[PDB]
Design a protein around this nucleic acid. Structure first.
Ligand SMILES: Nc1ncnc2c1ncn2[C@@H]1O[C@H](COP(=O)(O)OP(=O)(O)OP(=O)(O)O)C[C@H]1O
Ligand code: SF4
Ligand SMILES: [Zn+2]
Ligand SMILES: [Zn+2]
Ligand SMILES: [Zn+2]
Lengths: 512, 495, 86, 39, 97, 158
RNA sequence: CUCGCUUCGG
DNA sequence: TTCCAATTTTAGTATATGTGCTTCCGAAGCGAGCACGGTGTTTCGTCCTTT
DNA sequence: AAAGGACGAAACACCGTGCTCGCTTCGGAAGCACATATACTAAAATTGGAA
């Protein structure tokens, strides 16, 4: 996880600072440790260690546990720090699914980690007073309605709550309050009668205290998986099938957990009645769609029952395996060409195969199929089986069989993606550091206009901003800006491949 | 005006931190990349090739040709490394056992170590105590290896973990799909039935479908070690600062400087005397080129794997020239000196050049008795005393004596052979130049290499040394004859 | 037999395949703008702890004018363990 | 250890190297300090 | 060198070193085995712990931490051989005080 | 035909151009058939069935095209379609048909249809590091570093 | 010169 | 429900393949050094036919 | 006997290749010696089943 550690270091340095990213990296590299040994190994002051630990635990990046002799040990969640990169996607998807009020809610929750409902509604109203104008005030009622709508859809979840001290062991205070999580009040919003209007930044006791909220990234991941499956099946058969499976997944969202080989099965009649009325579809059309999808060699859905007319289920892990396979074949095709992708798909469909059979089945001339096979072997895209005639394992007396292992190749690709995003961030930071001189110069000359905007603002300061030598350097500034934009776009888009690969790797584990 | 920089500090070595170098660090340390398998140029001058072995950017080994990296002669050049890229990763023989051990410790699928959380915490707490010794580290590694080999399934990803063993030479086999006498697992049945196409096209696969376990070639082992979490690295008893698991498999070879591999130009014939390391490096580069050519030309998998095994064997022989599991058809013809051979043995660096080494300012002569000498005195021949010199520093006490010694010169016995000036360190041979002027210009602090005179403390030894009295310090008295003479009462200690 | 090479291979060997052009649309550009906004706003956020500047040359009457002032968030010490109060 | 001292070319700790020698130079530790007028 | 025909010097074998150790003569042992046989002055980088040349460390691409150090030449040969064997000896230097 | 000859080999030479043209023509025919089936929009079952093309049918279409002089058997076009399947562009299903104009496999006929890819190219290949051939040697401080990497230089300049 | 081999000496 | 019988599981416990060692100098000398297999190109000497 | 144009051969670089013509093929271990891990085996313990 060296690439993961490097990416976490870059993210923490970009997002929180230096004295805190050191603590985060030390925790990730060394695991759970008490505070004093962390301070000793890091080599910084105890106060800085405490500040870093509290700011990290505020954003739910680290957790603390009690052990023998009442010592508290802090363990970092590397996966959570990596999930920090999906924040733009989280905000965009909550802006798509809801109004911009929910977008601001999720943005505040992600930027603050843990907050109270009153705090989030106050901040959202204050920020939204800027969006509108002409004296219109932002009321807490609609913000609370959007917040509870997010809560019932499991996008925002209550943070683990400290147990009551008076009822639980009244007496000496423990070193750590041992926060526990209760699913009863997991998504129960408090009843807050207070309302108000956000201030317009003129610059001229808490009923829900103790109830902290956060963003439920698991719900976002489930929604992203549903979106990916819907997009895939839309690309495969038709938009009608995409809508059908989208409705089935929407029904399955609540009644199933986040990790199951199959969802709860559905009957044809409830799919028909739950489908949006905008589609002029009869019952027999839906049954035809269900049975033709059931016969798809991708096995996105399955019958798995006959009662209630057309009884159907959705294969989640099979769909994720198919998506990971598609990602692997796409990266192979784009890195080595369509012929190499043909060889890769051939050796994937045929579980084990030899060179002569590959040449016979691919219609690819010799000295080129072998070369591409060796190239893919050099990049761990497949492994040799090497069935030996004798235990001596001599190359002359054994058969070599090509076989693609989806799991190992997916892990390799995920590691490569981690290092790729790390390199993109490093390049962006290097360009920013090398052009910070022109950045400061242009910040000064533009702040000349930004200062004295209206008060004492004579027009004679508008023809001299471009007078300085910054004008020929504006081309370098534009190149820097477009390079940063492209790097950020690519860094964001590689995150989708990371999400698909990570979901596939997670869903193939048993955690026994 | 002038920046204050410290000239020299009396730095003393405190301790040596052993470790390993990653392939990136090898490139950073090295100066050039060696890609040419030939040594000298085609022309009759036979100058060493550029970017090949014996390139003088890696130091120099001849008194006439200076180093190209640092413009210094053979005496002053410390030597510089190079790096050779390997087309296919190869197991480091010295760490091979360690590799196997690590492969036993960790999961073969999710790369996590086979330890429960409670056992993880217990071992971390046991390792966190200060003052951990090397023996304690080895014992802890043994205990952790035993407790990890106790388990057979993964607590992290749930994948099965069979036994990992060394089959053949430098080959690791993992018994992932072991035969189950009881009810068979779905995984092994699926693996067995996945060979349908191979059986259809080749029937011989079906009888040999057994014993078909996972083979951990260096590529897969390197890929797995690159995914080991850094948290579990200390649990492998390996220091994170010293090295990483990915360093155990070598993909770059640090070709040593020319000082380690002297080359002798035997102009009497059309050839040169080269040590075994240069030839092994030449063979390794040739194998890399051959493997690249075979990959380009579309060769069979059997010969590709044969070339990979040949490269692994050549790397192992380059590191250790005395292996055991070498196949007879793959056995070396003659005998080569690997690094292990250069290190170990009675003529190795430790025993032949580090613990006991040859010295100058010494002589060896037949002895004869002389009872007229005191027991603390030894008679030294005049001829030897004229050769063995002592550097006497000029002070206010011996100036009038060293003046006479300088005046005598290198011929008369009481005298000197060299004068080293205080200001400039240029030695002056006393056989040439006006010796009277040099004696008149003897400044305080000058070093005079005087002849061995009466009263000099001199070590005297009989080479088969049994007890500490076999070597003693005597007072030298110069005598006209040619033998070392001492009182016979001192015969018994020297035997 | 393979040929002998006089110069090492180029540090960056050329590739005849180039990266696929980035996805475009209103959503992707909104993602880019939102990420830049997060960068600009979370550095001024009090959670971003700066390195404490030290070794002031002298004290001056202008210090009060140049004194950096920033509101500080107060952690909820009820959830946080006792060891991290200042 | 002695053997590593020999290999590294440093005086070994046993024997005459156990102790350290000091020079009995005419000196005055903690000499008087010139007073600071401005502070 | 080894022999009289090649004008070689005498050899302090292992037992001679053992006898010198038994006497406790540390200074004479150091002078015989280091000063008079294979004394050398190398440049060690105090940051990376590796050997530099001419007051310059190529690994760190710097010259601030390079310090001179007296050492037997055979020890330098051993260190370079170990580096070639991927057994990297990193020297942590310190002041003689 | 195995030890010598074959419809692809001409004088001990594999014909890459011939197989490329065969792939192009077969894929164009399958794509046109799928487009017509989609535009028909009569019924999803009938749409999928009409999008399906028999191996005998596409072989007859190829023979009608007559690109090359060598006679192409039905299994030759079957192998070409199998290679197209391995290219990830067409999909084959074995349906039950006792006898008909094909009559090739006993009670089974292979139907081929042009099918779209599952997903667009992934985000990884949209970055130079995802396609870098010296990705292993890339390091923060060294000769090959992202700060001085040529691939991102060309990519951002382009 | 390097390396090995022998013969010595003790 | 519970005593016996059977199966498994791990652990320990005896042999038998590996790797590792085997005095300190010192002195001469003799050998022989990486190659050699066949293939091509160049240089040179002479089987007749010519004064 | 003195010629000279063309032919043949012979001797030295040269590259494909790996010191052995063909593919085989032996013997001997050198001894004292602490590891190993394999295979076994064995008992003891736990769980299933007859009464
Ligand atoms: N191999 C050896 N190792 C160590 N010392 C040796 C060796 N060979 C000879 N010497 C030296 O020679 C001496 C041996 O002489 P020693 O055995 O006592 O008398 P000797 O040779 O039996 O004479 P006599 O036969 O008694 O007249 C002692 C030792 O310092
Ligand atoms: S930074 Fe450059 S060299 Fe490194 S992986 Fe990315 S593209 Fe390749
Ligand atoms: Zn040099
Ligand atoms: Zn695992
Ligand atoms: Zn350095």
């Amino acid at each position: 996880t060296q690439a993961e550690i490097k990416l976490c270091s870059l993210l923490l340095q970009e997002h929180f600072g230096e004295i805190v990213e050191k603590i985060g990296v030390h925790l990730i590299r060394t695991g759970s440790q008490p505070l004093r040994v962390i301070a000793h190994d890091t080599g910084t002051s105890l106060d800085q260690v405490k500040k870093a630990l509290c700011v990290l635990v505020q954003h739910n990046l680290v957790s603390y546990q009690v052990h023998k002799r009442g010592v508290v040990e802090y363990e970092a969640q590397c996966s959570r720090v990596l999930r920090m990169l999906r924040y733009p996607r989280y905000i965009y998807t909550t802006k798509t699914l809801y109004s911009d009020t929910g977008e601001l809610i999720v943005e505040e929750l992600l930027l603050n980690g843990k907050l109270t409902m009153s705090a989030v509604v106050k901040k959202v109203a204050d920020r939204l007073t800027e969006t509108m104008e002409d004296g219109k005030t932002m009321d807490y009622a609609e913000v609370s309605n959007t917040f509870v709508r997010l809560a019932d859809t499991h996008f925002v979840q209550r943070c683990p709550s400290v147990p009551t001290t008076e009822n639980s062991d009244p007496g000496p205070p423990p070193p750590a309050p041992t926060l526990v999580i209760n699913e009863k009040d997991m998504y129960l919003v408090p009843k807050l009668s207070l309302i108000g209007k956000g201030k317009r930044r003129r610059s001229s006791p808490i009923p829900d205290d103790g109830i902290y909220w956060q963003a439920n990234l698991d719900r976002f991941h489930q929604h992203f998986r549903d979106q990916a499956i819907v997009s895939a099946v839309a690309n495969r058969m038709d938009q009608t099938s995409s809508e059908i499976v989208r409705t089935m997944l929407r029904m399955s969202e609540i009644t199933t957990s986040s990790s199951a080989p199959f969802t709860q099965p559905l009957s044809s009649n409830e799919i028909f009645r739950s489908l949006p009325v905008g589609y002029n579809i009869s019952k027999q059309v839906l049954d035809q769609y269900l049975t033709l999808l059931a016969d798809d060699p991708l096995e996105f859905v399955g019958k798995s029952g006959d009662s209630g007319g057309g009884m159907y289920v959705i294969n989640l892990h099979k769909a994720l395996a198919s998506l990971a396979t598609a990602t692997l074949e796409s990266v192979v095709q784009e890195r080595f060409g369509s012929r190499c992708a043909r060889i890769f798909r051939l050796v994937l469909q045929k579980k084990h195969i030899e060179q002569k059979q590959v040449e016979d089945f691919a219609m690819i001339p010799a000295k080129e199929a072998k070369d591409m096979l060796y190239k893919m072997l050099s990049e761990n895209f497949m492994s040799l089986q090497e069935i030996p005639k004798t235990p001596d394992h001599a190359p002359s007396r054994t058969f070599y069989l090509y076989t693609v292992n989806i799991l190992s190749a997916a892990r390799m690709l995920l590691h490569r993606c981690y290092k790729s995003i790390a390199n993109l961030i490093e390049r962006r930071q290097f360009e920013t550091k090398e052009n910070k001189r022109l950045l400061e110069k242009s910040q000064r000359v533009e702040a000349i206009i930004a200062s004295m905007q209206a008060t004492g603002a004579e027009e004679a300061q508008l023809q001299e901003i471009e007078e300085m030598i910054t004008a020929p350097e504006r081309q370098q500034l534009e190149t820097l800006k477009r390079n940063v934009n492209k790097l950020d776009a690519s860094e964001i888009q590689v995150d989708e491949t990371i999400f698909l690969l990570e979901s596939y790797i997670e869903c193939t584990m048993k955690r026994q | 005006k002038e920046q204050f920089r410290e000239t020299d500090v009396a730095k003393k070595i405190s301790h040596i931190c052993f470790g390993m170098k990653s392939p990136e660090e090898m490139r950073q340390q090295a100066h050039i990349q060696v890609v040419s398998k030939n040594l000298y140029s085609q022309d009759n001058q036979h100058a060493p090739l550029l970017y090949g072995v014996l390139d003088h950017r890696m130091g120099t080994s001849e008194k006439d040709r200076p180093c190209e990296t640092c413009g210094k002669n053979l005496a002053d050049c410390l030597g510089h490394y190079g790096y050779i890229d390997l087309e296919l990763p190869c197991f480091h023989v010295g760490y091979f056992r360690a590799v196997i051990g690590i492969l036993q410790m960790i999961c073969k699928t999710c790369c996590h170590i086979m330890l429960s959380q409670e056992e993880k915490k217990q071992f971390l707490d046991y390792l966190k105590r200060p003052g951990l010794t090397y023996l304690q580290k080895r014992g802890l590694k043994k205990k952790i290896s035993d407790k990890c080999r106790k388990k057979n399934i993964c607590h992290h990803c749930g994948a099965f973990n069979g036994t990992v063993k060394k089959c053949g030479l430098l080959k690791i086999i993992h018994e992932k799909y072991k035969t189950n006498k009881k009810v068979v697992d779905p995984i092994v049945s699926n693996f067995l039935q996945s060979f349908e196409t191979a059986i259809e096209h080749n029937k011989e696969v079906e009888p040999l479908l057994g014993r078909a376990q996972e083979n951990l070639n260096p590529l897969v082992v390197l890929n797995l070690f690159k995914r080991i979490p850094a948290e579990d690295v200390p649990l492998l008893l390996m220091n994170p600062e010293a090295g990483k698991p990915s360093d155990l498999i070598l993909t770059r070879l640090l070709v040593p400087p020319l000082c380690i591999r002297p080359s002798v130009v035997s102009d009497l014939k059309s050839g040169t005397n080269e040590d075994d390391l240069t030839m092994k490096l030449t063979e390794i580069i040739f194998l890399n080129d051959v493997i690249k050519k075979h990959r380009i030309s579309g060769a069979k998998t059997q010969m590709i794997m044969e070339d990979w095994d040949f490269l692994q064997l050549q790397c192992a022989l380059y590191i250790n020239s005395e292996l055991s599991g070498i196949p007879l058809n793959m056995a070396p013809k003659k005998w080569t000196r690997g690094f292990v051979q250069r290190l170990k043995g009675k003529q190795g660096r430790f025993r032949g050049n580090l613990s006991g080494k040859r010295v100058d300012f010494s002589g060896r002569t037949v002895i004869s008795p002389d009872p007229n000498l005191r027991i603390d005195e030894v008679a030294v021949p005049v001829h030897v005393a004229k050769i063995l010199t002592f550097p006497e520093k000029v002070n206010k006490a011996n100036i009038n004596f060293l003046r006479k010694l300088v005046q005598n010169g290198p011929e008369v016995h009481p005298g000197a052979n060299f004068i080293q000036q205080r200001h400039t360190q240029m030695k002056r041979f006393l056989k040439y130049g006006n010796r009277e002027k040099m004696a008149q210009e003897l400044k305080y602090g000058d070093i005079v290499e005087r002849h061995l005179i009466d009263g000099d403390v001199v070590l005297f030894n009989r080479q088969p040394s049994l007890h500490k009295l076999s070597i003693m310090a005597h007072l030298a008295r110069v005598k006209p004859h040619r033998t070392f003479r001492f009182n016979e009462c001192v015969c018994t200690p020297y035997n | 037999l393979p040929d002998v090479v006089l110069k090492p291979p180029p540090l960056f060997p050329d590739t005849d395949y180039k990266p696929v052009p980035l996805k475009t649309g209103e959503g992707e550009e909104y993602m880019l703008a939102l990420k830049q906004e997060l960068r600009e706003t979370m550095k001024r956020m009090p959670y971003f702890i700066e390195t404490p500047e030290e070794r002031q040359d002298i004290e001056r009457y202008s210090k009060r004018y140049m004194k950096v002032y920033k509101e500080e968030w107060i952690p909820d010490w009820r959830r946080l363990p006792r060891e991290m109060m200042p | 250890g002695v053997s590593e001292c020999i290999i590294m070319g440093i005086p070994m700790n046993i024997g005459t190297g156990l102790f350290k020698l000091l020079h009995k130079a005419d000196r005055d530790p903690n000499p008087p300090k010139r007073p600071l007028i401005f502070d | 060198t080894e022999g009289r025909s090649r004008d070689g010097g005498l050899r302090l074998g292992e037992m001679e070193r053992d006898c010198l150790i038994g006497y406790g003569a540390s200074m004479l042992l150091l002078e015989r085995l280091m000063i008079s046989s294979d004394a050398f002055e190398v440049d060690v980088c105090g940051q990376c712990g590796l050997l530099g040349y001419s007051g310059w460390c190529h690994y760190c691409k710097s010259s601030c931490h390079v310090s001179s150090l007296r050492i037997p030449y055979a020890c330098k040969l051993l260190f370079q051989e170990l580096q070639s064997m991927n057994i990297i000896p990193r020297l942590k230097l310190s002041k003689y005080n | 035909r195995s030890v010598t000859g074959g419809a692809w080999y001409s004088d001990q030479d594999f014909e890459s151009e011939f197989v490329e043209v065969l792939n192009q023509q077969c894929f164009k025919f399958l794509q046109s058939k799928a487009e017509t089936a989609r535009e028909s929009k009569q019924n999803p079952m009938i749409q999928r069935n009409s999008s399906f093309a028999s191996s005998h049918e596409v072989w007859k279409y190829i023979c009608e095209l007559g690109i090359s002089k060598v006679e192409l058997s039905m299994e030759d076009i079957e192998t070409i379609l199998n290679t197209l399947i391995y290219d990830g562009k067409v999909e084959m299903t074995i349906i039950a048909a006792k006898e008909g104009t094909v009559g090739s496999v006993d009670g089974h006929m292979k139907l081929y249809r042009a099918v779209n890819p599952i997903i667009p190219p992934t985000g990884l290949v949209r970055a130079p590091c995802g396609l870098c051939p010296v990705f292993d040697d890339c390091h923060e401080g060294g000769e090959i570093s992202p700060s001085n990497c040529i691939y991102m230089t060309e990519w951002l300049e382009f």
